[PDB]
Ligand binder design. Structure first.
Ligand code: CLA
Ligand code: CLA
Ligand code: CLA
Ligand code: CLA
Lengths: 121, 49
């Protein structure tokens, strides 16, 4: 129900679709039905950079980082056949879609650590 | 002919100019604090406590 001229600017197009609390109602998978996924979206919030542990060998760490490039982070519009193989488990094989958003978070120190948030292939 | 150590004596009386003096050795110190403070800060490494 929302137009681009209605959603542009909110920095909403980077946050993706919710499902209201009428959930927990399982989807009836067949095994007699082909089934595919439509725009699988991964909106993120927590980026943690495993701290290059100092020479000492006691539990390496996973520090929290500050986001830099505003909102250029989330990824969606991912589609792919959703396989229903033996033992009734579902396997989703992505064929294409926007999934390689390049983000750069600022580490504990002043480090600028850039990764390529992606769920490709 | 007033020798240098005697030159800072100038004031002694005239607390006015003197206030501005302490008013300085004070604005000169404070500075040095923030100063090297920045400095040390420009070099302290946190990487490992
Ligand atoms: C209410 C009475 C009162 C108060 C609170 C003070 C306070 C002070 N006097 Mg002082 N003084 C007083 C009466 C007072 N005096 C009287 C009656 C005489 C003789 C008649 C003097 C003669 C005297 C001498 C010779 C000196 C002082 C100095 C000082 C300062 C020493 C510490 C300082 O450098 O910190 C640093 C201060 C701050 C970081 C902030 C304080 C300044 C703000 C709070 C005041 C507001 C700015 C503006 C309105 C000017 C205020 C002037 C007024 C507060 C004195 C300190 C601010 C020393 C000094 O500071 O000289 C520069 C100094 O050498 N006084
Ligand atoms: C404990 C607090 C304290 C005290 C009591 C003093 C007292 C003094 N300071 Mg001072 N100062 C301080 C903290 C203090 N300062 C801090 C934190 C800074 C920031 C760096 C300064 C920066 C400063 C400057 C730029 C000057 C002073 C000066 C002075 C003197 C004013 C008149 C005079 O020199 O008397 C008599 C003072 C002496 C005869 C000098 C004694 C100092 C000796 C111990 C040092 C010997 C040489 C030096 C350590 C190494 C040489 C370096 C090279 C350039 C030759 C006075 C003795 C003025 C001064 O001429 O010398 C003090 C002056 O120009 N101060
Ligand atoms: C009011 C605001 C303010 C605040 C919050 C600070 C805070 C600080 N200053 Mg600082 N500073 C100030 C104003 C201030 N300063 C001003 C106005 C000047 C110049 C006029 C300075 C000049 C200065 C220097 C040169 C240095 C600092 C430093 C510091 C840091 C350590 C100092 C400390 O912990 O001493 C702890 C101990 C005391 C505060 C007291 C020690 C002195 C006592 C023992 C004198 C006794 C008084 C006498 C006995 C009175 C009679 C007692 C009677 C009541 C019984 C700290 C962050 C140090 C630092 O590393 O920062 C970069 C440092 O080297 N400052
Ligand atoms: C504590 C603060 C303090 C203050 C406000 C004063 C103030 C004064 N002292 Mg003095 N004095 C002090 C501490 C202080 N003194 C101490 C601790 C000592 C023994 C260590 C002396 C020994 C002394 C002597 C023998 C004489 C004075 C004299 C004086 C008066 C004029 C001298 C002058 O300014 O030379 C001018 C200062 C210079 C031209 C600076 C050059 C000297 C050195 C090379 C400078 C080095 C300091 C600078 C490079 C950086 C400072 C760093 C700081 C940490 C010291 C003046 C009222 C004179 C006086 O009034 O007659 C009795 C005098 O003859 N003082």
């Amino acid at each position: 129900t929302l137009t681009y001229d209605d959603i542009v600017g909110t920095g909403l197009a980077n946050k993706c679709p919710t499902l209201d609390d009428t959930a927990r109602g399982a989807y009836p998978i067949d095994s007699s039905q082909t089934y595919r996924i439509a725009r699988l979206c991964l909106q993120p919030t927590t980026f943690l950079v495993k701290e290059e542990p100092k020479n000492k060998r006691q539990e390496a760490e996973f520090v929290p980082t500050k986001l830099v490039t505003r909102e250029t982070t989330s990824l969606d519009q991912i589609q792919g056949e959703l396989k229903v193989n033996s033992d009734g488990s579902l396997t989703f094989v992505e064929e294409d879609g926007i999934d390689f958003q390049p983000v750069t978070v600022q580490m504990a120190g002043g480090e600028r650590i850039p990764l390529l948030f992606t769920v490709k292939n | 002919g007033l020798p240098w150590y005697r030159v800072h004596t100038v004031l002694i009386n005239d607390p006015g100019r003197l206030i501005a003096a302490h008013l300085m050795h004070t604005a000169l110190v404070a500075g040095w604090a923030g100063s090297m403070a920045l400095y040390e800060l420009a070099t302290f490494d946190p990487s490992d406590p």
